[PDB]
Design a protein around this ligand. Structure first.
Ligand SMILES: NC(=O)N[C@@H](CC(=O)O)C(=O)O
Ligand SMILES: NC(=O)N[C@@H](CC(=O)O)C(=O)O
Ligand SMILES: [Zn+2]
Ligand SMILES: [Zn+2]
Ligand SMILES: [Zn+2]
Ligand SMILES: [Zn+2]
Ligand SMILES: [Zn+2]
Ligand SMILES: [Zn+2]
Lengths: 363, 363
């Protein structure tokens, strides 16, 4: 007996096109998404060229329309030069991404004043998300308060961070957050197995206490999002390993395993992979779209999942219970038991749908 | 014709006793203070042992009462273990010091949650000051807002920092700040002369643009404070140079030079070295206390000032106009033209004076 889920949404993926297509491209990354029960993705802007201006966004839109197999929205990225220049294209993007710490990214900002400038100039009704670790969470929250608007914190990974966000929510501040599966299912205990190259990720893997704190504070977590960050094994194991894990194909099976163990409910999962992503990012419904999962099937994660070009996974060897059997996207069978059945180009930019524009007051 | 100033107050000095007395002690550091026209100092807690508990404070109080030549108050320091334990001695201290970045300091905190715990437990009516650089300024401001109280930012050194504080003040937030003379009178341009050892300080020396921004935003600066941070020349020039500059003997002459050039007014100076320190830290008046200065005397700063045991200065070679001629402290001549005339032990802990207790609601 299969369980029918709505079309799940991942608000944090790196699809590497343009410029990093040996790691992933729209076609392979969205095949990975569908195999993971994900029908809509929001793609990050740290590509080459980075998506930090109108011409780069125009290029990315066309590459995505031609290559994507599931639906999508594209983030713009904040840079040290583009505050006040994105107004005409802002509404066409998923939101604005700020890179506020060292990571795989034309996009670290030099000064909190630059953060302020982005918060002041980006349209007030549109989403802003931040890579903001440890005290940077508190710093960007301060900027959001100074500018009287909301912020969403990407990949929360630490007890320190989730407790700070919890305190902010208790004070009624408009902040939301997401957590990635590696910060719920991996920890320092796994670094010996992974090694120092494969194990590189930002935020880094946490202690047992960090992981426990995220689970204990599930009520504070608004979304799950993979931070699918594919790099090849050669890159991960070479002399300058880039940070990041692939994750689209493993996220839902890991979380279904947790549901079957009673660690969170099916509803808790669907709030975090469907309803809250919709409402925070104003993402539209997908008509005649659903995912069928088998909650009884036990399997062990292999050394690589079938679709991501990363061709490795840090979850290798973990036992999971739960699998994606079928995905229907807008009335067409998109995935069945390991076979993707929609071509590159089937996916659409949801920000172009009438129902996908973010509502705003007449300007 | 001499000009009579009130007794000036330096709210940020390191006097090194206990535990670092080759660098400075209460007797030498307060001789330096008097020679710089300073009659009251607030001593930082990063000594050995650090002043992070009641027994250490008791020791420091006695060393200061026996050695100080000018009046003083002693800071307590926040640690990873002492939140919620300082309530009985808190009112006897200048305030609580938080070290939130890497510097010469049992006292970096590991987590913003520890900052929160200090803000929640330290008595709400007593001062909190923070070493908080760059985004850390925004982070500690957020903690202050979450806990509904004020904070004072030590040694502001950058355009980024002063503009963030300016924005916070424009929003009516209870934040004050101080600036040290090296961040007004030295910059990157001086690193070639100083060398990489002598030039080590936290916050580091800024660009020309940083320095210009502090002057342009003088209205945002509540206090001047030296961050007198003596280390010997051997230490500064050795294999692991500690950060910090001595500054008590040079601060007032540097600032008087600026006054004579019309860069700020005498009143601007006295607000920042007398009235604002009094009101932010609730420091009492000193009866029959004043400083006589000669604003016409031109001289060049030598390779070391007479009193600090640091026995070096980064301002060597700078031409100044203005000198301290005489200091009277509580009715006794304390300093005349290079001679200190009050003995170690003349100085008193102002927090023990009836008028030096911080007012509070009946608890
Ligand atoms: N998280 C990572 O380790 N890497 C991400 C960058 C990011 O999300 O910060 C990537 O794009 O490779
Ligand atoms: N500022 C410095 O460079 N050093 C100070 C420490 C401090 O004020 O942060 C010291 O105590 O030596
Ligand atoms: Zn990130
Ligand atoms: Zn994110
Ligand atoms: Zn990412
Ligand atoms: Zn400091
Ligand atoms: Zn200070
Ligand atoms: Zn200091």
């Amino acid at each position: 007996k299969l369980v029918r889920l709505p079309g799940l949404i991942d608000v944090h993926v790196h699809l590497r096109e343009p410029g990093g297509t040996h790691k992933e491209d729209f076609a392979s990354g969205t095949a990975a998404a569908l195999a993971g029960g994900i029908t809509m993705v929001c793609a990050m802007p740290n590509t080459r060229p980075p998506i930090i201006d109108a011409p780069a966004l125009a290029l990315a839109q066309k590459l995505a329309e031609a290559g994507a197999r599931c639906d999508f929205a594209l983030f713009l990225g904040a840079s040290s030069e583009n505050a006040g220049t994105l107004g005409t294209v802002a509404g066409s993007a998923a939101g604005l991404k700020l890179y506020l710490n060292e990571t795989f990214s034309e996009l670290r900002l030099d000064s909190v004043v630059q953060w302020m400038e982005h918060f002041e100039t980006w349209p007030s009704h549109l989403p802003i998300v931040a890579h903001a670790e440890q005290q940077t969470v508190a710093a960007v929250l301060m900027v959001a308060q100074l500018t009287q608007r909301s912020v969403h914190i990407c990949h929360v990974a630490r007890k320190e961070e989730i407790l700070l966000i919890k305190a902010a929510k208790a004070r009624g501040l408009p902040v939301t957050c997401e957590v990635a599966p590696h910060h719920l299912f991996l920890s320092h205990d796994d670094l010996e197995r992974l090694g120092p190259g494969k194990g590189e990720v930002r935020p880094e893997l946490g202690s047992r206490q960090d992981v426990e704190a995220l689970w204990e504070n599930m009520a504070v977590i608004d979304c799950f999002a993979s931070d699918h960050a594919p790099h090849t094994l050669e890159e991960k194991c070479g002399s300058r390993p880039p940070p990041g894990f692939p994750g689209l194909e493993t996220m839902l099976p890991l979380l279904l395993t947790a549901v079957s163990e009673g660690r969170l409910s099916l509803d808790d999962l669907l709030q975090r992979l469907h309803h809250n992503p919709r409402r925070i990012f104003h993402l539209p419904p997908q008509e005649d779209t659903y995912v069928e999962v088998d909650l009884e099937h036990e399997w062990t994660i292999p050394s690589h999942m079938p679709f991501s070009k990363a061709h490795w996974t840090p979850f290798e060897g973990q036992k999971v219970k739960g699998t994606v059997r079928r995905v229907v996207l807008r009335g067409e069978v998109a995935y069945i038991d390991g076979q993707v059945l929609v071509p590159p180009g089937y996916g659409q930019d949801v920000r172009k749908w009438p129902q996908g524009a973010v509502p705003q007051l007449p300007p």
